[PDB]
Design a protein around this ligand. Structure first.
Ligand SMILES: [Ca+2]
Ligand SMILES: [Ca+2]
Ligand SMILES: [Ca+2]
Ligand SMILES: [Ca+2]
Lengths: 93, 93
């Protein structure tokens, strides 16, 4: 498998483990998601009031409007954040 | 950095290297994208006529309708495919 595929598997393992740790194993609640990204993602720095925006972005990602996310919503949710790291990269180099 | 972040960096390195290899370094053409995913992604098996759908999905991902993709479009483009691997996982176990 390509390195991209190797990296991809990582998303499932972390999603499954963290999701499994709290709440229903099958579903990840927003509360679990917020804690997951805040701790695991550099966004921790954005934990301040900026973190509130996290609530705002969930609405757009969730077509259901349910407030809950599925693996499909999660993969795109992290993908959007990934772009931010790219922005950060600009700061270095 | 979290494992997810470690895996995330992989997307940039592969995107940059492959994109850099052919065409403009700054932009990735669809032709380059098709070859990249076909070879690097298991989708290689789907290289058959199914591969044609690859053209169809690009239209939805590209808001511009330009036929070209940016890192932002690419990250979501791979994210959609990622879900397919999950489907594959069901076959195993
Ligand atoms: Ca859960
Ligand atoms: Ca939802
Ligand atoms: Ca290129
Ligand atoms: Ca485009």
């Amino acid at each position: 498998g390509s390195e991209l595929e190797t990296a991809m598997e990582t998303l499932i393992n972390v999603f499954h483990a963290h999701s499994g740790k709290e709440g229903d194993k099958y579903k990840l609640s927003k509360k679990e998601l917020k804690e997951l990204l805040q701790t695991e993602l550099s966004g921790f720095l954005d934990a301040q009031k900026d973190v509130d925006a996290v609530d705002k972005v969930m609405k757009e990602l969730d077509e259901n409007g349910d407030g809950e996310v599925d693996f499909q919503e999660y993969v795109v949710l992290v993908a959007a954040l990934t772009v931010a790291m790219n922005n950060f990269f600009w700061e270095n180099s």
